[PDB]
Symmetry: D4
């Protein structure tokens, strides 16, 4: 649908006077200390998305960061463990009110071992997400139309998933488990930034 592309930051928050915002990122790789943040995508759940290109060496994005810091607004991620880490490493603010659809999937879709976003969207919404058959240079000065549409597709459905997962968590009486997991998730991301990314800190060995 409508995808608004920005350089550096949102112009304002007129579209984000809401109770929950869907958030995703794109980077040059899986290691936040080496691989810089290149794109941030946002959606209010109204079927539109904002795509913000982040410049190399950029240290601040005040409007976006105010949104990320607002404790009255839940940030919805799929596998937020990574996005939280890269966002905190880049802008210096660790979000602390979050919902993760992957943790929710692992707590509710107990009849499968496939917890990726594509499988969740397919099963829960009968929506077919098409995943790029190649990767791309997210640090490119000009993003392609295909890149923009792929980047937007990762945030367009997270509100609907959160609603369904919240009903299922209520149904199976696991709400407090999920709440505690989401409360701990930002510290799991911090542990990743500090150097324990390969360690399950709670395991016996």
């Amino acid at each position: 649908t409508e995808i608004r592309v920005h350089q550096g930051d949102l112009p304002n928050l007129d579209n984000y006077r809401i109770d929950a915002v869907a958030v995703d990122t794109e980077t040059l790789g899986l290691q936040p200390h080496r691989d810089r943040l290149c794109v941030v995508q946002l959606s209010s759940g109204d079927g539109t998305a904002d795509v913000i290109q982040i410049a190399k060496g950029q240290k601040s994005a005040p409007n976006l960061v105010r949104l990320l810091s607002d404790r009255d607004i839940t940030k919805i991620f799929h596998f937020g463990r990574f996005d939280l880490a890269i966002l905190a490493h880049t802008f210096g603010v660790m979000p602390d009110v979050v919902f993760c659809t992957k943790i929710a999937s692992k707590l509710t879709r107990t009849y499968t071992d496939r917890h990726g976003l594509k499988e969740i969207c397919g099963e829960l919404l009968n929506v077919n997400i098409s995943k790029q058959q190649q990767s791309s240079d997210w640090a490119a000065e000009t993003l392609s139309r295909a890149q923009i549409e792929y980047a937007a597709s990762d945030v367009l459905y997270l509100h609907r998933l959160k609603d369904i997962f919240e009903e299922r968590l209520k149904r199976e009486e696991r709400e407090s488990v999920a709440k505690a997991c989401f409360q701990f998730l930002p510290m799991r991301a911090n542990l990743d930034l500090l150097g324990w990314s390969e360690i399950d800190i709670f395991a016996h060995s």
Copy 2:
């Protein structure tokens, strides 16, 4: 060392008007749904210990449970993930103010991969704990003297370790990380009881 052996429960809490209590358990195995709790050992950090034999089918232990429920008293474990699970499964109360020396070791003793209690005690206190060369039936009606001495030896040093680990956590500026881990540890134990004991809930796969 003075070891007081009790049947079922502590007679009173006269010996436990303190800020922190060391706690450990002994079971018939690693699976709380199959392997029953057999012994609970406690120490005030003094030179004496209390060893409480738990009967088959015992569902209540009012004095012990008061300690486990008292939010004003920190419960010290080594690998509390297991002990919390078996205690909650046995008595129906999940402690929520805990300190775990194994998590603290993983957060401070970054120069080694051996985090067992014997090795920790050896490095931090130059105390040699001798571990039994065989296992035994902890459900026996009468415990042997060797069993009682081993059970007491498992709690006598956790206070000194906690003091040292708190010094190290302050030194390396990891106090808030440890605090968040300890806050989440009871829910990790509940996740174990509910059926996710073999799953790292935060891993990508």
Copy 3:
């Protein structure tokens, strides 16, 4: 295909005055202590099937359990190790006269290592079994038509397989081996319920 869908139980056993009944289950997952029984499917071997949706917390299903307890009726399963476990956990009655097509396949189809129901039906009957709905929300209040047809397809062919496998077991002179395996299968399922689900009880290690 005629599929009769019921809530809670069969109305009567008028359609099941027979020597063998095909049985299958659906659940929320592979772990009976966490994942509740959601659907039970039955077939008389005719062109119709019964699909009984089981409610959350349901403890009783007298007509179904009566059928399961009738020692004059052989219960046919594919991989009955699981179905027997979940049935016994849910209703408290362990069937003791059973036939399992997966054990029979391993005892007769020695020229292949693929013993799943789809492959067996393909080889033995030239019948094409489809999929995709296997991983779906079986706890939904209203099952979809696709879910109902997929659930029924799992019982429609077990009688024909039992007939062919009995012929093959006779041909290779392995009938008494199979009979002994079927006699032990309920105890293998009980061992699973008691906590040895990950243990080969007969292995050296």
Copy 4:
């Protein structure tokens, strides 16, 4: 200890008018079709043992086979899965009333993963069995004194172990599980002889 050595068979059954006999074997290796049975040792549970040297190509041992066939005498083995296989392969008779200390250990000593005979004897009886520091040619025409004493040491304690394991099976309410396992054990051995020795017939894969 008194060890009576015989060639071929017992002279008579005067010492074996008893309710249970301990049985063990020695062979040229683990594969009954290649590696012949070389020695059979028996004990009445007293302080003496019988060691019977079996000749190459020997097809019959009437007194021994009388014991193996007698349904009024329980045959005690440690890991009878192997001994039953080699005995049935050699003499054509499969015992069908058996007790196995390894299954009993796996059903009762749930607090350890070490189920060897040495560990069981050490824990349950505080008896130290010394195992040969070298292997040897059990097919030798004349066994050494060290060989004979080692071979006998494998049967002198099985009665005492069976008595203790019977107490634990009663205490933990697993008597019927053990009984069903013992009934299936001869068929597990037959499955081994027929060619499924590397296959857990009850596993999903």
Copy 5:
């Protein structure tokens, strides 16, 4: 594409007055002691094949066995290690003049790791072998036409492959290497029959 189907044995050797014969087998599985020989296939190198059904318990096939033991006729196999084993086990005669296309492939097609018959036929002859969609009951009294054609397809091309592989062995100067491997192959099969099927007899460990 003449395929002559026989019961028990060839009627005579009029079509096999030749210097080399292509040979293949079908069985109930990979373990000769458990899985009986069901079919023997022969080819003169022409466009026709002979498919011989072997009965359960059959001990003799004088014309076939005469062919197998005639040292002036080279027997061509693909992976003859197996066929030689099952033939020797069934009829009591081990061929000693053989050619194996798998050894030849491993000695000449060093630029690939895929040495199956389909890949060899595709690369060297541009012949497309179509493999069944599953395995089948080769012990059936009447083989289907599709089964017969597949069985014939396995021998129709071995002469042409032998000719090409001989050219390749001459080109890379490995004729004596291949000859020594072929000389040892019957004894490798004997080791398999005797019980070393899982052992590389030449490996250090």
Copy 6:
């Protein structure tokens, strides 16, 4: 395209008075001591290629070796570790001014784990390389048209890739890292020839 096929050597260097030449090889396999060099392909980057057939036992190729030795011409490879080894082993000259697109990919395409030439050409240039549908000999006296066109396709695009990778290396400020890696790559190939091909010489173990 125009592909010039030669026997033994280039006729002259009239087409190669240039700053960089794309180089690839084909062999009988991955082991230079066993598997001889069969074809060398070259391109100046003008959309044409030279395909040079190397004879068995050929020790010299004077015009080609002049190109390989000339320090003013950068030799571009994909996974030059192999090509450098086989070229030096065959003609006795190790190139020392090289660029490798695989090392460059590992230093720049950090967002993917697929670094093969097909994936790089597909992703970076939107060019579809169609690879062999089987293997080939390459030792054939006369190469097929399909072989020649496939062989040429491996050098036609390396100049464009080198240009892009050099731009990306500049963007992420990794030029000196790549330069040091390329300086060491010939010595890595030499280490392979001397016998350390299976050893990461820099690993702790």
Copy 7:
């Protein structure tokens, strides 16, 4: 032995007007971004050593760094890949004239797979290195005598090993191999610092 312990830096370079200096480090762990440098050890090759305690957050050590940047002085390490990384990370200077005894061992001691310092010293010098029986806190304000003597023992023998290894490299004609490996080693360490510490940059996969 004489061991001089310093705080922060060497007092002067009066003892290091030499051609080669032995260098080793101790840290809080294997990950330079998390685990700080705690101790630096130096030796002139005589019977004395210098042990320099490095403070938390220390950015400068001018005399030490003069040694590190003196192109006329070879720095001898055992497994310098790590020490170079941690030194460059801490003080911002990468030594570029180095010798590593582990690379030399892998290039000369080809008859063994054990390349640790204890085994090398044992074989080459008949010197017994005693390894600490526990791990310790190298960040302690005051190191114990056992710690100081252990830390010194790691540098006292590197000169003698370098002499012997140089003889071995000349004898086996691998001098140029070693020189190229040593020249690349600082860049391998830089690659570790940049984020490729887990990647063999030269491997095919």
Copy 8:
């Protein structure tokens, strides 16, 4: 005992007019193309041995190679697969009358998985071989006395082992199996030299 040390070759064969000679080698490592032959040991089976130091680059040893070529003299090895390879690589002559105690052990000592020379000598002869406490430089100009004695100990007992293994091979009726294995063993070594050292040429994959 008496150990005669020579450089290059035996002075004559006066002590080796015998029907079987024990042979062993020492090298700089496991890869014959990289790691040169350093020592050859010989024994007549009496209480003395000859130890011959081989110089770097030495291409001929006429008396030794005369011994190796003599078809009337059986060469006894332990794991001759390696020694045959290195001998053929060094002197160009492949022995073709051999006996290997390791193959014999694998064909007779079926009751164990431990086939090393030390274990064999311990079991079969009650002879204690003491193995070096480290590795050493076998290319040293002067071998130490301890080195010479260790090297000699590997040949002093092979005759007695051959006699015992031949008795056992007769007893289990595996003489023709062993004979065929020994005939192929030189060709297994040739395959190693040609480049198939890591390939079981007879395996399915």
